[PDB]
Symmetry: C3
Subunit: 335 residues, 3 copies
């Protein structure tokens, strides 16, 4: 009755990937919700594996390099994340998905690095308004949360400056292993790199013209044709329209409806190959109290879908009956 | 030019079906709106038939029984509603639809009971995020608004405890006469009962995959194949997304857009078989002032659609002409 | 790489077309946004051509006539607008689109009059919840913003009262040159006139049943079958759902999503025939501060789409390279 009967949960409160304080509170926003209770009610055993502690150096220890802000905090955090994720995914070798709540999206370099150590043939589905694939010299902002894929993609390595402390961050993805859904705010150089290297991508224009059902099918066909590969689902909450997820740092109008977001997660979950899902860029310090509740709510529905929640209902584990309790039914009485 | 040239309007301010105070104000929220004026502007004669007074016993007279809260208030209210609705529907035997504004959804047991006395072969279209079909021993909350269909469905009667005061509540529906649209939060035992007894149901997943146009067609095909039966349309305002109907007691994200809600009502109206439409679960005491206005607005658009309002326009009853008033037109002047 | 490499921008702060103060601030709402910057970032040279000064007479000089409010302010403003637009469109005879920001929708009589002087064979795509085609004796409100097309449509001229000061407002459109998208609140007499004279129209019902992709295609087929004609795109911000454009004077629920609005503008832009786009009915004095930001944001996305912005990305004008700066890449280092 369940594709996944257990799962692990991990918080990664990254906040040095971008300048707005508050992504560090994303994991708590989910823990304070009814997520755990709802997952248990569906028959899934979810273990809270705690939080990764990011490395947050001071300004003096971590000056700008190649325009990148907090790049040594990033490289050290990346290795610490990768070790923890690798360990969890290997203890897991019905499989046991790992649910990761961020934290800004810079955590993805580490989560995918560690995941790939455990599952080298994985594919990545990146759900985001943005490409998050800027190389350091092309980034206008120097914010690491806009660069996490660039360090992982083998075809991009001639455009990444060498730094000694980045050595352990080995590019573990081919361009052919990634597919985007939800894009609507790409930087020019991202557009160039995505098209040059043939990365599968489905922008909001494609979703409008094709419909989300065909988009999901084509994205899975592009990177996981026969469902042979483990799936790393990297979900930026800002992929969803700001009407349903306002509390995030770089909101862009015209995003996925919650329903469209649910359909992506339902289909990925149903492959039986969901290995890691991470949800990035929750920021409970942004927007009104009601904005935060809407965003928390959307996130909870999304994550539950990833774990197998069905909108069309679940059957009871045990079917209750009146006679058992010694109670008289209307039907019995009429007889 | 009109499928329905007259209609009746009835308020049922039920509030003992669920614990949040304020559903009793639903009928006034519609009367205070421009609904009546707009319906008249479409050429429909709408008669306000007043309000049913619910029976609201005190705690001492109405203790919990089989976990149900306010079950004797419910049984007495149900019979009082059924008598009034039966009387109105028989005085009506182009037909004259009855528009009912609630009130929490527990009123439906009474409205359908009385409707079926006048029209025994009716079908029911239940538009709701929820199944409202819990039997009393399976209800986690004991709230009657989550159980109204269970008492009506013949196939369920071995799961309903006998109570003397429920005797006059005779099951008048077969499972084959009901179809749901909009479901996204079913309890496990509801899911079990719906599937076991073959009740037609179209959840938000079905709406996503099939599109609302096909869903409406399939729902009508399932319970009213050749448009031979009178239609009881039971519309829970919470079927609509909380972005358009926030002021309701059990809001669930990812609901029908207003447009999708309009399409259901337009198609049902256009069958010529709309006999009763009820709109349940408005609660003007929930949310901000603007939340209440949004919810009132959505409700008014929905109800107008049920009565035949066309978004593509209506023709004037009399076409005005310049010469008639002795006025010179530009065309006339140029000649 | 660009269909349009330059464009002109003009503000028309009309506010005598309707009673709510604030449409006069629409052009500033766009100038205060990041619109200009974003358009430049796409490689388009946009020239701000300033604002037209509307003629605003006093009550004594401009009494009601045929029930019309401020009709002489309207006729004088119309001629002043038409002269300015004609001059700009002729200096422009890759073409150079003119972007016009209003201002209430009464400005359209002038913008289309002047546009047609420069391009007599134009077609009009009118994106609006409303018909804006009431003739003066049928208007319930006497607000000119609800009548701008009636003065332009040749087939309607026997229903327009003659006024000497309207003489220079020559009907320059055939009914066959106009198509509506987005309608959901037509007056009865508008409905009558649209159907009688065969004006192509796609209401929200049509958008629901056909989908926006087919609607856009059919609208262009109806008025511009082989893309031979210049396009005047008249976009009332109230065509969009009040959830995305709340700050406008006559909001109607159940409108176009931003995405649907974007698709209209993208397809019109891509014809290469976009000659004028005007955006009407922004009112920054309506709604909360956040309402105004949402409305400004929607307007900016819409206008950028009209000018060729692609949600699927743009390529860089110059591709940056590491070696050029004398920087060592990871790939280089490994070798
Ligand atoms: N492309 C921009 C925005 C990055 C957005 C980061 B993301 O998708 O995690 O929110 C940048 O490089 O700064
Ligand atoms: N299934 C829940 C919720 C019922 C919701 C009631 B309704 O759809 O009228 O809002 C219960 O039995 O308590
Ligand atoms: N049909 C109404 C409303 C007009 C709406 C004007 B428009 O579309 O510019 O907002 C009237 O004549 O007053
Ligand atoms: Mn993003
Ligand atoms: Mn991201
Ligand atoms: Mn409900
Ligand atoms: Mn209900
Ligand atoms: Mn309008
Ligand atoms: Mn308009």
């Amino acid at each position: 009755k369940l594709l996944y009967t257990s799962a692990n949960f991990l918080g990664i409160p990254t906040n040095r990937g971008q300048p707005k304080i508050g992504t560090y509170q994303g994991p708590e926003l989910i823990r304070k919700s009814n997520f755990f209770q709802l997952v248990a009610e569906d028959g899934i055993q979810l273990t809270d594996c705690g939080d990764i502690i990011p490395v947050e150096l001071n300004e003096a220890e971590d000056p700008q390099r190649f325009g990148m802000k907090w790049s040594r905090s990033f490289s050290l955090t990346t290795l610490r994340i990768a070790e923890r994720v690798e360990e969890l995914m290997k203890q897991s070798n019905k499989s046991t998905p790992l649910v990761i709540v961020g934290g800004d999206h810079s955590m993805a370099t580490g989560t995918i690095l560690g995941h790939a150590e455990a599952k080298p043939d994985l594919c990545v589905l990146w759900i985001d308004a943005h490409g998050d694939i800027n190389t350091p010299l092309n980034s206008a902002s120097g914010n690491m949360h806009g660069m996490p894929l660039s360090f992982l993609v083998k075809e991009l390595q001639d455009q990444i400056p060498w730094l000694d402390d980045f050595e352990g961050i080995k590019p573990c993805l081919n361009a052919s292993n990634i597919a985007y859904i939800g894009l609507r705010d790409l930087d020019a150089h991202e557009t160039h790199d995505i098209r040059k290297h043939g990365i599968a991508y489905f922008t909001m224009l494609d979703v409008d013209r094709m419909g989300i059902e065909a988009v999901i099918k084509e994205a899975l066909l592009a990177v996981n044709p026969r469902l042979e590969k483990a799936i790393h689902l990297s979900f930026d909450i800002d992929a969803l329209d700001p009407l349903v997820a306002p509390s995030t740092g770089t909101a862009v109008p015209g995003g996925l409806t919650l329903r469209e977001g649910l359909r992506i997660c339902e289909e990925v979950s149903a492959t039986g190959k969901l290995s890691v899902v991470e949800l990035a860029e929750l920021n409970p310090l942004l927007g009104s109290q009601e904005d935060v509740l809407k965003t928390q709510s959307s996130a909870v529905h999304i994550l539950r879908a990833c774990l197998g929640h069905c909108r069309s209902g679940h059957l009871p584990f045990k079917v209750r009956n009146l006679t058992d309790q010694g109670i008289m039914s209307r039907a019995a009485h009429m007889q």
